[PDB]
Every structure is written in structure tokens, then in C-alpha cells.
Amino acid sequence: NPLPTRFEVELEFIQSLANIQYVTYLLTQQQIWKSPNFKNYLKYLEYWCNPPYSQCIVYPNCLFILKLLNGFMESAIVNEDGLLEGLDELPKIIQLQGPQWMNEMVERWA
Amino acid sequence: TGIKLALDPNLITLASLVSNPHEIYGSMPLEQLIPIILRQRGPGFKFVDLNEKELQNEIKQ
């Protein structure tokens, strides 16, 4: 059994954004959105949007979720101490609009 | 691979995603279309500010 490749782990994590439960689990930790490395990783991951990397994706709503959360990033400025302003209320947006997005994409599935 | 394909992107379902800003503004009648126009033009925008030559040299830029 070889080790899980960077391609495989990054593909499974980028695909996990389709489920809203995973992202609302991730965004409740303060240190995750407080970390600028995770922010850079969020701006690292748009390479899945372009082919042929997009071919292996099974549920493209994860790519939609990736594109959606990036619009909240240019309003965020990281300081010298690492406090990312503007991310204090975006997880609250996620819990308020949580069932809305996933019900909308379930009706799009139908 | 094969050959390419160019599609009419606005219509994929038979009887939208490409936001061409003309059919999603010019289709509606003007009486309710003007409010969103001066809302999107600017905050506190008034009907008095719209002008011929202003847009005529805005397209010239």
C-alpha cells in the first residue's frame, strides 16, 4: 500500500466542500480561519477549476462552494499578529444560509 | 482527443449561467427596470443625474 498522494488527498478535500456539514464543521474552529496559511490554501485550490484537473471531480457543487467562499476573502486583511478581520461573521453566514444552499442544489439535482 | 465544441451557453435546457447583462436588463418593462438601474448606478443616485453626453463619453473611454 503506497502512501496517499498529494493529488489524491487534495482531490478528496476539494470534493468534500459539496457537503455543507463538512464546511460548517471546519469553520467553527477559530484557528482554522484565523490561520493565513489556510487562507493561502483557499487561494491555492482554484487549480481544480481548470481542466484537465476538473475531469476527475464527481460532485461539482464542491467547486461551486470553493468559488463562493473566495468572494469573502478580498474583504479580509491579515495583520502582523495574524488576526484575520472579516472572518468573525462568515461562519455565521454559513449557519444562517446552510440549509438554503444545499436544499437549492438538491432541487437542482431533481 | 477529438474535436472541440462551441455551444450556445445561455440555452442548454430545451423546452442563464453566462451573465450577459443585456437580456437580463432589457427584457423587463422600464417602469420597474429604472429602480434597479439607479440603485446599481450608485448610492443615493437620482434620476436627475442621467445624461446623454456623460454616457456618450463614458463609452468613449
Binding site: P60, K67, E104 | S19, L30, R41
Partner: protein, 85 residues
């Protein structure tokens, strides 16, 4: 086979869904076209309207008609369609 969602991916990298959050924009050519056809609208609206002698001085411009009396006032008016005032 599901060609529509694969088309959405190969077009934008994302499927089509309504966006309540950023992930509108009015064209300036469209607003000038609507401005000039609204000028035509208010110009043909006063075709069926008789105009008084103190207010025969009018300027159909800037999406309006400039009903003016010299050294007294200038009122500029517009309508939405024909059958409404």
C-alpha cells in the same frame, strides 16, 4: 448522460446555481439606449398632449423634457410608458 452540468464545469469550472453572495452590473450602452428611447417616449407622450403658450419652451434631453418659463422656473418631467401619466 448529463451533458448540462458537464457543460457548466467546462464553461465556468462550476455548476449553475443562483448566487445570493458574491463568488450585478448595468451596461452603460444599455443605459444610454434606454435613456434615448425614454427621451423618445417622453417626446411622443407630448404629441397627444396639447402644450400651453407659457410652457411651449421645452427641451427633450437627459431622459426628461425641460418645461421652462424664462426667469421663473424650469420643471423637468418624465414618464414610464404611454398609458401612465
Amino acid at each position: 448522460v448529463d451533458l448540462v452540468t458537464a457543460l457548466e464545469v467546462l464553461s465556468l469550472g462550476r455548476p449553475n446555481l443562483p448566487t445570493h453572495n458574491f463568488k450585478a452590473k448595468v451596461p452603460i450602452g444599455l443605459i444610454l439606449q434606454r435613456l434615448k428611447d425614454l427621451n423618445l417616449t417622453v417626446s411622443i407622450k407630448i404629441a397627444l398632449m396639447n402644450i400651453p403658450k407659457p410652457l411651449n419652451s421645452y427641451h427633450i434631453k437627459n431622459g426628461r423634457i425641460y418645461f421652462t418659463v424664462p426667469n421663473e422656473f424650469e420643471i423637468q418631467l418624465s414618464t414610464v410608458n404611454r398609458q401612465s401619466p
